[PDB]
Design an enzyme around this catalytic site. Sequence first.
Site, PDB file in Angstrom:
ATOM      1  N   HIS A 231      13.283  80.657  70.840  1.00 44.29           N
ATOM      2  CA  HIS A 231      13.792  81.833  71.477  1.00 44.29           C
ATOM      3  C   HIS A 231      14.678  81.488  72.675  1.00 44.29           C
ATOM      4  O   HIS A 231      15.770  81.966  72.744  1.00 44.29           O
ATOM      5  CB  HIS A 231      12.614  82.673  71.921  1.00 44.29           C
ATOM      6  CG  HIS A 231      13.030  83.973  72.577  1.00 44.29           C
ATOM      7  ND1 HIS A 231      12.846  85.224  71.993  1.00 44.29           N
ATOM      8  CD2 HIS A 231      13.534  84.194  73.815  1.00 44.29           C
ATOM      9  CE1 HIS A 231      13.283  86.147  72.829  1.00 44.29           C
ATOM     10  NE2 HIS A 231      13.707  85.552  73.943  1.00 44.29           N
ATOM     11  N   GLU A 232      14.226  80.595  73.564  1.00 46.21           N
ATOM     12  CA  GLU A 232      15.060  80.206  74.721  1.00 46.21           C
ATOM     13  C   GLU A 232      16.324  79.453  74.215  1.00 46.21           C
ATOM     14  O   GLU A 232      17.390  79.597  74.830  1.00 46.21           O
ATOM     15  CB  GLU A 232      14.305  79.262  75.637  1.00 46.21           C
ATOM     16  CG  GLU A 232      12.982  79.857  76.138  1.00 46.21           C
ATOM     17  CD  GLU A 232      13.082  81.241  76.760  1.00 46.21           C
ATOM     18  OE1 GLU A 232      14.165  81.700  77.046  1.00 46.21           O
ATOM     19  OE2 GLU A 232      12.045  81.862  77.023  1.00 46.21           O
ATOM     20  N   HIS A 235      19.011  81.850  73.127  1.00 48.61           N
ATOM     21  CA  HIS A 235      19.708  82.397  74.309  1.00 48.61           C
ATOM     22  C   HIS A 235      20.697  81.381  74.790  1.00 48.61           C
ATOM     23  O   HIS A 235      21.853  81.689  75.080  1.00 48.61           O
ATOM     24  CB  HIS A 235      18.738  82.625  75.482  1.00 48.61           C
ATOM     25  CG  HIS A 235      17.972  83.907  75.394  1.00 48.61           C
ATOM     26  ND1 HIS A 235      18.580  85.121  75.139  1.00 48.61           N
ATOM     27  CD2 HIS A 235      16.662  84.162  75.590  1.00 48.61           C
ATOM     28  CE1 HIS A 235      17.652  86.065  75.111  1.00 48.61           C
ATOM     29  NE2 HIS A 235      16.487  85.519  75.422  1.00 48.61           N
ATOM     30  N   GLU A 270      18.278  90.565  74.638  1.00 44.21           N
ATOM     31  CA  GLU A 270      16.931  90.307  74.055  1.00 44.21           C
ATOM     32  C   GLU A 270      16.698  90.827  72.627  1.00 44.21           C
ATOM     33  O   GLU A 270      16.144  90.094  71.807  1.00 44.21           O
ATOM     34  CB  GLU A 270      15.817  90.786  74.991  1.00 44.21           C
ATOM     35  CG  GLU A 270      15.948  90.123  76.294  1.00 44.21           C
ATOM     36  CD  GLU A 270      15.543  88.655  76.245  1.00 44.21           C
ATOM     37  OE1 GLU A 270      15.005  88.158  75.229  1.00 44.21           O
ATOM     38  OE2 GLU A 270      15.774  88.020  77.258  1.00 44.21           O
TER      39      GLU A 270
HETATM   40 ZN   LIG Z   1      14.546  86.317  75.711  1.00 48.95          ZN
END
Ligand SMILES: [Zn+2]
Length: 433
Positions: A231-232, A235, A270
């Site tokens: 997830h990071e 991003h 997000e």
């Molecule tokens: Zn996030």
Amino acid sequence: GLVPRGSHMPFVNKQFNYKDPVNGVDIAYIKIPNAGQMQPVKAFKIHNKIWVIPERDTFTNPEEGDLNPPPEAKQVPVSYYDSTYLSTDNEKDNYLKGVTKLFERIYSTDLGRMLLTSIVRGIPFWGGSTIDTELKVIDTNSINVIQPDGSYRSEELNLVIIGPSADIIQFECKSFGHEVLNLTRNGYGSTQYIRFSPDFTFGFEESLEVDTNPLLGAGKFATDPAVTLAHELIHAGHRLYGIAINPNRVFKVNTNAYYEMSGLEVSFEELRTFGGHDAKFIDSLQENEFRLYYYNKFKDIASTLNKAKSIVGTTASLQYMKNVFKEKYLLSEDTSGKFSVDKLKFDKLYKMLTEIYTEDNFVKFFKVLNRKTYLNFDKAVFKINIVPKVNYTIYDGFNLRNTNLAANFNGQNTEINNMNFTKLKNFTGLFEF
Ligand SMILES: [Zn+2]
Ligand SMILES: [Li+]
Ligand SMILES: [Li+]
Ligand SMILES: [Li+]
């Protein structure tokens, strides 16, 4: 375990030990740019363009030097403080091993190989030059590495994984060089510093009605920290390609009564990163606007490249670097040597970074249980230790084959696999309802 891709070389070729002597190449004291008299910190280069600093982040944000938990009265519900965590050499060694193992778990999937490859290729653009006949690096996309002779050399990099700041479970991304340009949103990209810990994970509920309710559930299942690192990394992928969405672009959540009644908002960035059904809450009109905007920024980059006729510095030739960016942005080159953005290729690259690399898709690859939406409520935080292979493996995470943990996500079930989780805090019931 995960859906494999077949034998491949490791993402991290060295098994680093925190106490290994510095060599000034891939184990070295480093300084971040524009840091004045900051003491150097020991850092480990795990792969081309990616470094790990196993220290708590007291160095990136001037507003964030104290690791001390604020007054109990001051602390939010979903947060956790421990000023001593990552203070000792053994913890740092564990941190290095834990981060290493999660990169290897990610890279063992085809989706993870694709994302990590995009990340290494996503060199922050050389937008540094005051004049356009010359192509120059932006030196905030570099670190200063102490060599064996005690002198500094500057090294370009794309990604640094560092320990958390005061709130252990807040995994922010810091980057530099954006005091005037929003490097993460103008196509250029910038080196990302991701605060992350492989030593804690979050509890969630397996029933959708319980997980998306702020008053129910204690966090029966533990999130696999490879999903959280992925997830990071997603991003970071958007930020290295300069197409992250301004966090002021938000969904004023109205699909969950509890979010609504508290007026909770969630950024498009997000929802995009989560993927699945969540990405559908991004307004299509706004999404179409975003695509066009990023497409135009990529056209600006192609124009910039086109004007450059010499390079600054001696790391690489002008031709090397024009090609690195042709690769990165998948530019077209004409009979005359002019670069352009092809709409079809742009749509492919944008889609790959924003629709293909998503949390929900990583869950499918890892075959783990996970939250089904970002629009839920955290239940609990757990202390874990993924370093011993008896606890967690590259191929199976917690759900170890040839054990009672292999089926039904038993390994993530914190009641069955209770030796692998120490619950540190409950969040349910601390919510503002
Ligand atoms: Zn996030
Ligand atoms: Li500690
Ligand atoms: Li395993
Ligand atoms: Li336990």
